[PDB]
Design a protein around this motif. Sequence first.
Motif, PDB file in Angstrom:
ATOM      1  N   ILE A 110       5.264  34.667  -9.386  1.00 39.18           N
ATOM      2  CA  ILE A 110       5.500  34.286 -10.805  1.00 39.18           C
ATOM      3  C   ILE A 110       4.173  34.178 -11.556  1.00 39.18           C
ATOM      4  O   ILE A 110       4.118  34.669 -12.696  1.00 39.18           O
ATOM      5  CB  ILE A 110       6.319  32.982 -10.893  1.00 39.18           C
ATOM      6  CG1 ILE A 110       7.708  33.180 -10.276  1.00 39.18           C
ATOM      7  CG2 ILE A 110       6.349  32.570 -12.351  1.00 39.18           C
ATOM      8  CD1 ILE A 110       8.532  31.930 -10.177  1.00 39.18           C
ATOM      9  N   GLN A 170      11.439  27.837 -10.892  1.00 39.63           N
ATOM     10  CA  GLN A 170      12.178  27.739  -9.602  1.00 39.63           C
ATOM     11  C   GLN A 170      13.000  26.452  -9.583  1.00 39.63           C
ATOM     12  O   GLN A 170      12.433  25.367  -9.387  1.00 39.63           O
ATOM     13  CB  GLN A 170      11.199  27.710  -8.442  1.00 39.63           C
ATOM     14  CG  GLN A 170      10.404  29.007  -8.315  1.00 39.63           C
ATOM     15  CD  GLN A 170       9.642  29.050  -7.012  1.00 39.63           C
ATOM     16  OE1 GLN A 170      10.240  29.114  -5.936  1.00 39.63           O
ATOM     17  NE2 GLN A 170       8.324  28.931  -7.081  1.00 39.63           N
ATOM     18  N   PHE A 196       4.526  26.676 -18.675  1.00 38.23           N
ATOM     19  CA  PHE A 196       5.767  25.982 -19.124  1.00 38.23           C
ATOM     20  C   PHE A 196       5.433  24.989 -20.242  1.00 38.23           C
ATOM     21  O   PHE A 196       6.148  24.957 -21.271  1.00 38.23           O
ATOM     22  CB  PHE A 196       6.483  25.403 -17.910  1.00 38.23           C
ATOM     23  CG  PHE A 196       7.748  24.666 -18.218  1.00 38.23           C
ATOM     24  CD1 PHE A 196       8.713  25.209 -19.067  1.00 38.23           C
ATOM     25  CD2 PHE A 196       8.009  23.474 -17.572  1.00 38.23           C
ATOM     26  CE1 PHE A 196       9.894  24.534 -19.299  1.00 38.23           C
ATOM     27  CE2 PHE A 196       9.196  22.803 -17.803  1.00 38.23           C
ATOM     28  CZ  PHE A 196      10.116  23.324 -18.676  1.00 38.23           C
ATOM     29  N   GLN A 205      14.334  19.407 -11.658  1.00 37.37           N
ATOM     30  CA  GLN A 205      13.749  19.509 -10.307  1.00 37.37           C
ATOM     31  C   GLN A 205      13.281  20.935 -10.131  1.00 37.37           C
ATOM     32  O   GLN A 205      14.146  21.869 -10.215  1.00 37.37           O
ATOM     33  CB  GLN A 205      14.734  19.330  -9.170  1.00 37.37           C
ATOM     34  CG  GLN A 205      15.087  17.928  -8.804  1.00 37.37           C
ATOM     35  CD  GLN A 205      15.862  17.928  -7.501  1.00 37.37           C
ATOM     36  OE1 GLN A 205      15.304  17.824  -6.417  1.00 37.37           O
ATOM     37  NE2 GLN A 205      17.176  18.057  -7.599  1.00 37.37           N
ATOM     38  N   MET A 206      12.021  21.051  -9.801  1.00 35.68           N
ATOM     39  CA  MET A 206      11.340  22.341  -9.643  1.00 35.68           C
ATOM     40  C   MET A 206      10.635  22.393  -8.282  1.00 35.68           C
ATOM     41  O   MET A 206      10.104  21.350  -7.807  1.00 35.68           O
ATOM     42  CB  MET A 206      10.284  22.487 -10.742  1.00 35.68           C
ATOM     43  CG  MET A 206      10.883  22.683 -12.139  1.00 35.68           C
ATOM     44  SD  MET A 206       9.726  22.100 -13.438  1.00 35.68           S
ATOM     45  CE  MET A 206       8.375  23.230 -13.143  1.00 35.68           C
ATOM     46  N   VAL A 207      10.456  23.605  -7.793  1.00 40.08           N
ATOM     47  CA  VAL A 207       9.601  23.836  -6.595  1.00 40.08           C
ATOM     48  C   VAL A 207       8.571  24.891  -6.979  1.00 40.08           C
ATOM     49  O   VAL A 207       8.634  25.401  -8.110  1.00 40.08           O
ATOM     50  CB  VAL A 207      10.440  24.204  -5.360  1.00 40.08           C
ATOM     51  CG1 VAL A 207      11.274  23.036  -4.874  1.00 40.08           C
ATOM     52  CG2 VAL A 207      11.300  25.452  -5.587  1.00 40.08           C
ATOM     53  N   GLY A 208       7.581  25.085  -6.101  1.00 43.69           N
ATOM     54  CA  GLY A 208       6.446  25.961  -6.380  1.00 43.69           C
ATOM     55  C   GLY A 208       5.444  25.190  -7.220  1.00 43.69           C
ATOM     56  O   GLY A 208       4.348  24.885  -6.735  1.00 43.69           O
ATOM     57  N   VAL A 209       5.814  24.856  -8.449  1.00 46.71           N
ATOM     58  CA  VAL A 209       5.024  23.926  -9.300  1.00 46.71           C
ATOM     59  C   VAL A 209       4.757  22.607  -8.557  1.00 46.71           C
ATOM     60  O   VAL A 209       5.713  21.807  -8.368  1.00 46.71           O
ATOM     61  CB  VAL A 209       5.742  23.637 -10.639  1.00 46.71           C
ATOM     62  CG1 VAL A 209       5.071  22.442 -11.328  1.00 46.71           C
ATOM     63  CG2 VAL A 209       5.749  24.881 -11.528  1.00 46.71           C
ATOM     64  N   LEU A 238      10.656  39.538  -4.144  1.00 48.52           N
ATOM     65  CA  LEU A 238       9.272  39.772  -3.628  1.00 48.52           C
ATOM     66  C   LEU A 238       9.218  41.042  -2.761  1.00 48.52           C
ATOM     67  O   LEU A 238       8.106  41.503  -2.484  1.00 48.52           O
ATOM     68  CB  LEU A 238       8.744  38.529  -2.901  1.00 48.52           C
ATOM     69  CG  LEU A 238       8.041  37.489  -3.791  1.00 48.52           C
ATOM     70  CD1 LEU A 238       8.976  36.901  -4.842  1.00 48.52           C
ATOM     71  CD2 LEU A 238       7.463  36.386  -2.948  1.00 48.52           C
ATOM     72  N   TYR A 247       6.769  20.528  -5.149  1.00 43.10           N
ATOM     73  CA  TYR A 247       8.099  19.883  -5.416  1.00 43.10           C
ATOM     74  C   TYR A 247       7.874  18.822  -6.486  1.00 43.10           C
ATOM     75  O   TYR A 247       7.033  17.908  -6.292  1.00 43.10           O
ATOM     76  CB  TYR A 247       8.669  19.258  -4.137  1.00 43.10           C
ATOM     77  CG  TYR A 247      10.010  18.588  -4.277  1.00 43.10           C
ATOM     78  CD1 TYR A 247      11.001  19.089  -5.106  1.00 43.10           C
ATOM     79  CD2 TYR A 247      10.326  17.498  -3.487  1.00 43.10           C
ATOM     80  CE1 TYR A 247      12.225  18.463  -5.226  1.00 43.10           C
ATOM     81  CE2 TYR A 247      11.555  16.892  -3.565  1.00 43.10           C
ATOM     82  CZ  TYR A 247      12.508  17.372  -4.441  1.00 43.10           C
ATOM     83  OH  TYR A 247      13.742  16.814  -4.515  1.00 43.10           O
ATOM     84  N   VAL A 301      15.976  23.769  -8.451  1.00 45.63           N
ATOM     85  CA  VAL A 301      16.748  23.361  -7.268  1.00 45.63           C
ATOM     86  C   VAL A 301      17.629  22.192  -7.687  1.00 45.63           C
ATOM     87  O   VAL A 301      17.383  21.579  -8.735  1.00 45.63           O
ATOM     88  CB  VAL A 301      15.838  22.993  -6.085  1.00 45.63           C
ATOM     89  CG1 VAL A 301      15.019  24.219  -5.622  1.00 45.63           C
ATOM     90  CG2 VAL A 301      14.930  21.824  -6.408  1.00 45.63           C
ATOM     91  N   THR A 317       7.922  32.487 -18.874  1.00 38.04           N
ATOM     92  CA  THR A 317       7.757  31.996 -17.489  1.00 38.04           C
ATOM     93  C   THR A 317       9.060  32.159 -16.724  1.00 38.04           C
ATOM     94  O   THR A 317      10.112  32.490 -17.306  1.00 38.04           O
ATOM     95  CB  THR A 317       7.228  30.547 -17.479  1.00 38.04           C
ATOM     96  OG1 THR A 317       6.726  30.239 -16.164  1.00 38.04           O
ATOM     97  CG2 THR A 317       8.285  29.541 -17.901  1.00 38.04           C
ATOM     98  N   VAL A 332       6.811  32.598  -3.867  1.00 37.03           N
ATOM     99  CA  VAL A 332       7.491  32.893  -5.154  1.00 37.03           C
ATOM    100  C   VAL A 332       6.636  32.331  -6.278  1.00 37.03           C
ATOM    101  O   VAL A 332       6.513  33.002  -7.330  1.00 37.03           O
ATOM    102  CB  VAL A 332       8.927  32.352  -5.153  1.00 37.03           C
ATOM    103  CG1 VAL A 332       9.539  32.452  -6.520  1.00 37.03           C
ATOM    104  CG2 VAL A 332       9.807  33.099  -4.138  1.00 37.03           C
ATOM    105  N   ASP A 333       5.985  31.182  -6.090  1.00 38.83           N
ATOM    106  CA  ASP A 333       5.144  30.625  -7.175  1.00 38.83           C
ATOM    107  C   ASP A 333       3.975  31.587  -7.491  1.00 38.83           C
ATOM    108  O   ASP A 333       3.638  31.881  -8.668  1.00 38.83           O
ATOM    109  CB  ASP A 333       4.597  29.274  -6.756  1.00 38.83           C
ATOM    110  CG  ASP A 333       3.664  28.657  -7.754  1.00 38.83           C
ATOM    111  OD1 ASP A 333       4.153  28.127  -8.751  1.00 38.83           O
ATOM    112  OD2 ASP A 333       2.457  28.729  -7.510  1.00 38.83           O
ATOM    113  N   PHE A 381       8.722  28.936  -1.328  1.00 34.53           N
ATOM    114  CA  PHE A 381       8.505  28.443  -2.721  1.00 34.53           C
ATOM    115  C   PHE A 381       7.073  28.744  -3.141  1.00 34.53           C
ATOM    116  O   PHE A 381       6.832  29.133  -4.273  1.00 34.53           O
ATOM    117  CB  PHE A 381       8.882  26.963  -2.828  1.00 34.53           C
ATOM    118  CG  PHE A 381      10.310  26.685  -2.412  1.00 34.53           C
ATOM    119  CD1 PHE A 381      11.312  27.604  -2.631  1.00 34.53           C
ATOM    120  CD2 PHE A 381      10.628  25.508  -1.756  1.00 34.53           C
ATOM    121  CE1 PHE A 381      12.612  27.351  -2.238  1.00 34.53           C
ATOM    122  CE2 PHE A 381      11.929  25.250  -1.366  1.00 34.53           C
ATOM    123  CZ  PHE A 381      12.913  26.163  -1.624  1.00 34.53           C
TER     124      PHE A 381
END
Lengths: 219, 220
Positions: free
Chosen positions: B10, A201, B45, B202-206, A170, B209, A203, A198, B6-7, B3
């Motif tokens: 993106i 992210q 996605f 497991q995703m973040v931003g979307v 960023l 959590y 984790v 896409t 960054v989302d 997060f």
Amino acid sequence: MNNQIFESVDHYISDLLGYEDDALLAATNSLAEAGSVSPNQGKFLQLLAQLCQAKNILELGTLAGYSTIWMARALPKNGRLITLEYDPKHAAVAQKNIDRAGLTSQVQIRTGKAIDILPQLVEEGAGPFDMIFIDADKPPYTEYFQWALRLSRPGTLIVADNVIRDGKVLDENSTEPAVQGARRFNAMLGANTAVDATILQMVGVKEYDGMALAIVKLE
Amino acid sequence: QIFESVDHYISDLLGYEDDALLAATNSLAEAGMPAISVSPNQGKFLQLLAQLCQAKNILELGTLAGYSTIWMARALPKNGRLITLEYDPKHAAVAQKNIDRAGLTSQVQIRTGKAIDILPQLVEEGAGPFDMIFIDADKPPYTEYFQWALRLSRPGTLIVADNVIRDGKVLDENSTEPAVQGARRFNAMLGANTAVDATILQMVGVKEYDGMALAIVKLE
């Protein structure tokens, strides 16, 4: 970067859906025994390979073959995974790991610079690949992508790992080469009309990761 | 916050939302109904999964205002179809306006009712098989919704079930929250189910959590 909750949930998930056989644990241990992995990310890459009905897979960045094992396990017996590794000491260890996993016939490990081997694959007519997995040095990601497209067909999946760098991509003023390389790659993907794409992210037990997914369009 | 920032970075690159999608976001507040957070990056996605499946037949549980419906139906061929199930007729009316605004009227069928009633009817009608099935409805029934989704699948079908980790509350084996027990039973079912190969992403931003289950149906 991580969070206890992402690690605890990832263990919960791998306990259900992320079983690792002896070959995968040995591959993990093989790095120390000379000189971080996620089974859930391995299972994800395998499932992506299965969605591509993959018969021919290209991997940039073998390491000790951990992701190689997950992906080649999607292949049928006559399936092939070509994996490119810069470091001959890694390639040798990956070969032992591939053989222990029972994948000798399905995997071909090539040692050298990916930017030198990619045109060799084109010359040989090695493609097209159903799925391509890039987890190598970041500065060349944009150039690896163009070769990847030349080795693809309509509907090929191209995956490029570790492209968010803890949010540093960023920062338009970053002068860290890995961050500039990832930032350049992302900007190229944003503007690219040969693919639909896409960035996830992701984790879990591995540190916070961005993973690009791109589908090659019919021209 | 990292997060979220960054989302946005993106979605600015890779999650463009046209008028139809922005209008579907705003339609819930405008028709006097409750807000629902939406995620263009989750929609992209889902669209890419539909594209990778070469989907021509999609089933969705939980239409809401049709936001995900629009994303997935845009992956279809001209003669392709998406059947989407919605509990509440006012929501189905809003979603139908949103689908129409996207020009997807001919490819989408909204069925209003309880999903657990409509699923046996889709089997009786021979409405399957679906290339891709997206479940984001009430969680207590997730396991039975999955069993019906298998009856409407063929070998290679992708089944996606959203929001299965409940911000980590699924770790609590003693929870008496119906959604959390619903998510736990569903995840346990995947761990035990020999008819699918599956993971939970497991995703973040979307949705800040999220846990998204991905399952590929095998020939039994």
